[PDB]
Amino acid sequence: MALYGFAQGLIQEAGIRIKQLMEQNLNDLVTNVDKATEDFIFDTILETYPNHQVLGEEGHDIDTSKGTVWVVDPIDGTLNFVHQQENFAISIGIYIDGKPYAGFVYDVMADVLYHAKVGEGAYRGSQPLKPLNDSNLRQSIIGINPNWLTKPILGEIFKEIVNDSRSARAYGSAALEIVSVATGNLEAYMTPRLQPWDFAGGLVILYEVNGQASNLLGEPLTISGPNSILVGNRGLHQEISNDYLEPHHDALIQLHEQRFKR
Amino acid sequence: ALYGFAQGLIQEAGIRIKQLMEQNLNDLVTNVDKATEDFIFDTILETYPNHQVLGEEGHGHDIDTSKGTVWVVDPIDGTLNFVHQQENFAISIGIYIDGKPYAGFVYDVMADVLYHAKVGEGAYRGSQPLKPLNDSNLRQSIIGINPNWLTKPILGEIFKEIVNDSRSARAYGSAALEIVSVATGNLEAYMTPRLQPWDFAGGLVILYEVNGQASNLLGEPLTISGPNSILVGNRGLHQEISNDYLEPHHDALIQLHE
After folding, report:
1. How far apart, in whole angstroms, are the C-alpha atoms of residue A147 and residue A12?
2. Considering CB atoms only, which of B84, B87, B168 is closest to A172?
3. A224 vs chain B: nearest CA distance in angstroms?
């Protein structure tokens, strides 16, 4: 539990430093807080575990299958931060020899840390989260940014799933949206593009409550590269993938290759 | 005093919803909505016999909302959020005198935050005053709009271009709290093609008191006489969205509106 405990305190303490920076200043603050927060997180890890690797948003050619890897987003939801001064998270996923060990998403402005060690359950603070139950799409609320319904091809494909869902939401922080699936606040969430540091922490929490995650082609998520994202309770993950994205697989493959190849 | 009375009243309504959720441990939302509206209605009339109540649960259907003092109330704004999230829903109460705003109240029940305003006297988050809004450019603005409206044949095109130019979009699923979100600065604009009076009435007073503006999609003023489309924002991007993006589609909107 040692490294887990170190991560937990570190992320909370980095949250306190984010609020201190916001106080002093009472689109340039967010860049500055983003760098401050990653340099603190990087330096504290390096001081204590000198051989650990850090895959970070702020930039810190890394083979994520070898040794211990911290994948960090200092501020996930930067626009939320700039415009609302809340609804943004620090996110930390920790992986050992390519394999998930622990995940953390810290809602800095509510002081709520979501966290999970692989195998040991998922938590909101000191309260355990319950396993997820299956839903049908017809009774589910889903997370999806309205901007994706405007895009060529992607638009038409996401329209049907929006149409069948009961309703749709979008909160602007991917790590917090994936946690909203883990807590049952959304039955599913999707986006065509996310960096590893936006899903790594959230994914560990999701998996402890029996949720599932894939990309839009049903392929597993890994921290080796950016990807599209579909997460949900088992049941309706399989309905969205099987009945709504499957009939459009070739078009999704083409989008995927255009976005990610090379 | 009428203002203070409504403040105490909306909070007690919330305590009772919290009680019915607590005791229950999708028929819940239906019964809860009824008991809250009946509580609100019985408490208004018992102190103010001569007032009326235009209610989501069905009190005052077709009353003529221009005569006298009129309480326009939604007990659970965001019924889907209530069912699925047990949070992100609000009680909304607008008080209108002679067809004109007097006061507004939206109570985020699970966060225990009351947003309130009396015409001419400022808007509040509990006891903290809310700052007046500044102008934003559309390209630097976050807008609130549900993805669903982008699926519809004529609407989807009418909103497309405004989603594209805007910096990003969000959707919370409670119109009363989305309007309040425009009044607090968490959103720069919010829009939808259909909303009942009980879902905007309380929110509009809060907004007007921080200098935001509100109209329908055709730039016409909103009233409590019936359903309408909605566009709220700070002044500059209200004007940017209406003038520049909505105005070209007036004839299609005129048609949708009837």
Report:
1. 32
2. B168
3. 28
**Cα–Cα distance for residue pair B4/B8, rounded to 1 Å:** 6
| Gap between the Cα atoms of B249 and B119, Å rounded | 33
Q: Strand locations in A57-179, DSSP E?
A: 68-76, 89-96, 99-107, 112-117, 122-124, 127-128, 141-143, 167-169
Q: Give SS3 for A212.
A: strand
From A85, which residue of chain B is nearest by alpha-carbon distance?
B186
- Phi, psi at residue A101, to the nearest 5°? -110, -55
| Neighbouring C-alpha atoms within 13 Å toward the C-beta of B63 | 21
The radius of gyration computed from the CA coordinates of chain B, to the nearest angstrom, equals: 18
Give the single-character DSSP code of B61. T
Measured CA to CA, the distance from residue B150 to residue A256 in angstroms comes to 23
Q: Is the distance from CB of A202 to CB of A182 less than 8 angstroms?
A: yes
Q: Which segments of B16-99 are extended strands (E)? A: 52-55, 69-77, 90-97
Closest-CA residue of A relative to B26 is: A139
Contacts (Cβ under 8 Å, ≥6 apart) of B242: B215, B219, B231
Tokens 């809340």 correspond to what residue?
A: A86
Deposited experimental method = X-ray
Q: How many Cα atoms sit within 13 Å of A25 on the Cβ side?
A: 14
Say if CB B86 and CB A172 are below 8 A apart: no
Interface test with B, best of A26, A88, A150 (most B CBs within 10 A): A150
Size of interface A-B (CB pairs under 8 A): 75
The angle subtended at Cα B159 by Cα B242 and Cα A186, nearest 5°, is 125
Which is nearest to A139 in space by CA: A171, A74, A105, A186?
A186
CA B89 remoteness from chain centre: 11
Mutate: best of B25, B145, B165, B168, partner A, most A CBs <10 A: B168
Q: At what angle do helices A249-260 and A154-164 cross, to 10 degrees?
A: 130
CA B179 to chain centre: 6
**List of domains in chain A:** 1-129 (3.30.540.10), 130-262 (3.40.190.80)
Alpha-carbon Rg for chain A in angstroms:
18
**Quoted resolution (Å):** 2.2
Nearest to A146 among B163, B167, B188 (CB): B163
Q: What share of chain A is helix, strand, coil (3-state, %, to 5)?
A: 45, 25, 30
| C-alpha distance from residue A170 to each of B142, B168, B171, B210 (Å) | 12, 10, 5, 25
Dist CA B162 CA B219 (whole Å): 15
Using CB atoms within 10 Å of the CB of residue A25, give its burial: 0 to 12 exposed, 13 to 18 middle, 19+ buried. Answer: exposed
CB contact under 8 A, A147 and B168: yes
Angle at B73 between CA B232 and CA B33, to 5 degrees: 120
